[PDB]
Each structure stands twice: as structure tokens, then as C-alpha cells.
């Protein structure tokens, strides 16, 4: 997250860290949202590489023991059938991860709240992106969970030629684009929390930014619109 600030620890209890086995340890690669005690929602591209993955719930500092973490391996992976690694702009950047075991829910580990099917936010809706991604282009991962206020940019504006053009689809949510705040490498798969009627819900799954950089004016961070995949998520979980 570029232009953000350290989140209060465990203030986003559904945020998870998706990591792959790296040598004798593990390396954070993406964010994710815990949606069931044994299911995590993330971006499809986060699992394009068939590596060994694990999820860390209740995490805050990736390199320090916070006393609130739980580590669970990713057992099964279900990627949206329409996802095409060669065309992220086509959309469908979403995948569900079934965990090896169910994590224990507490104050640090909570199920993410999702929006009702089909809900689309009005322009400039209040949201926050969270994650351990880079805080600057060419930088390193953030050690502590970061958050940045990223108001939405509606489809009409976001899909305009000045912004993303047709690259952005109605199945996506845009947010930010002021050239200062944005998601960055390491934030993919993570949530875009938006406040609606007193409750923060995960309306987006971090997907991409401009090829020109993370924080680029008129190139808001783009997220998969969670509300467009409610039935898909339920079908996958129900198929157990």
C-alpha cells in the first residue's frame, strides 16, 4: 500500500497473508480475505504459479511474533473458470482457497463480511485498501499491515478514455487514482473495505494497477468486484 499508514493491529481481522514456501521459510506474496473458517478469497493470479501456499490469519507484522497469528496450509484451490492469466483485463480475477484445517475465530481472526449480490457503489464511496504490499515503487514489502483511504471511482469515470478505458469492466471496482495512494505489489488478493450503513464490507479483491506504476494519476487501483461473484463463491463452497 502506497501512501497509507500502519493499521491498528488486528483492526482488519479478516485480512490474511498468502505466502509460498521459500527455501526453509515462507514468503508473503498476496493478501486475501477469510470468508469461512476454512475458506479464503483471493485473486486468481495469486495462484497462477503452482507453488506451496499457506495462509496466516491474525497477522500484523510479517517478521515478528505478534502472538495473534495462526498458520494453516492451503489444501485445495478453486480458480474461476473464466480466469485467463494472459488477460487480467478480461476480469474473473478471483479464487477460493480451502484451508487444511479450520482456523479458530477470535478477536484477531474474523470472517469477512461480503456485500449483497450485485451491489455497486456510488462514485467517491469511502473505502480502505489494506495489505503488506510495497509502500513505494521498487520498495520492499511493508513489515506491518498498512491501510490507505481509497475512495471509489465509478465505472463511468473509470472506464472513460482518460482513465482505464475499456480495460476496466463493470465486474471490477476502481478506487484511488490520485497519483499518491494505491495498492502495490504484495497487495493482490487483498480486500478493499468499504463502509456501508455502519459496516465495512469487502467489495473488492485487489487485482492490478498501471504498467506505469502503482500510484499513477488517473490509473486507480483495480479490484475484482466481489458482489459480482456471490453466487460463484456460494457454488464453490456448497460444492464442498
Amino acid at each position: 500500500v502506497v501512501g497509507g499508514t500502519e493499521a491498528q493491529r488486528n483492526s482488519w481481522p479478516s485480512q490474511i497473508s498468502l505466502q509460498y514456501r521459500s527455501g526453509s521459510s515462507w514468503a508473503h506474496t498476496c493478501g486475501g480475505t477469510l470468508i469461512r473458517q476454512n475458506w479464503v478469497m483471493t485473486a486468481a493470479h495469486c495462484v497462477d504459479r503452482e507453488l506451496t501456499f499457506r495462509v496466516v490469519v491474525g497477522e500484523h507484522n510479517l517478521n515478528q511474533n505478534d502472538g495473534t497469528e495462526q498458520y494453516v496450509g492451503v489444501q485445495k484451490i478453486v480458480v474461476h473458470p473464466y480466469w485467463n492469466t494472459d488477460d487480467v483485463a478480461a476480469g474473473y480475477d478471483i479464487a477460493l482457497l480451502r484451508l487444511a484445517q479450520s482456523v479458530t475465530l477470535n478477536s484477531y481472526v474474523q470472517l469477512g463480511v461480503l456485500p449483497r449480490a450485485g451491489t455497486i457503489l456510488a462514485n467517491n464511496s469511502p473505502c480502505y485498501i489494506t495489505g503488506w504490499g510495497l509502500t513505494r515503487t521498487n520498495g520492499q514489502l511493508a513489515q506491518t499491515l498498512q491501510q490507505a483511504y481509497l475512495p471509489t471511482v465509478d465505472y463511468a469515470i473509470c472506464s472513460s478514455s482518460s482513465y482505464w478505458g475499456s480495460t476496466v469492466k463493470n465486474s471490477m471496482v476502481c478506487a484511488g487514482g490520485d497519483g499518491v495512494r494505491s495498492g502495490c505489489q504484495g497487495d493482490s488478493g487483498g480486500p478493499l473495505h468499504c463502509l456501508v450503513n455502519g459496516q465495512y464490507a469487502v467489495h473488492g479483491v485487489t487485482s492490478f494497477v498501471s504498467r506505469l506504476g502503482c500510484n499513477v494519476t488517473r490509473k486507480p487501483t483495480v479490484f475484482t468486484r466481489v458482489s459480482a461473484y456471490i453466487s460463484w463463491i456460494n457454488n464453490v463452497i456448497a460444492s464442498n
Partner: peptide, 28 residues
Amino acid sequence: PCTLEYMRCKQDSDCLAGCVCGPNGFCG
């Protein structure tokens, strides 16, 4: 576009979409 996953790489083709492999060995 360039995806926001943090991953090691050896060449630009190892990175997704329009992302390139930085001299530090990571996509961006």
C-alpha cells in the same frame, strides 16, 4: 496493466501482464 502480487523473477516473461522483472529480482 501490472498485477499486484509480490513474486521473485529472473526475467520479464516470469512476470504477469505488463509487469517487468526489476533488478532486485521481483516483479513490478
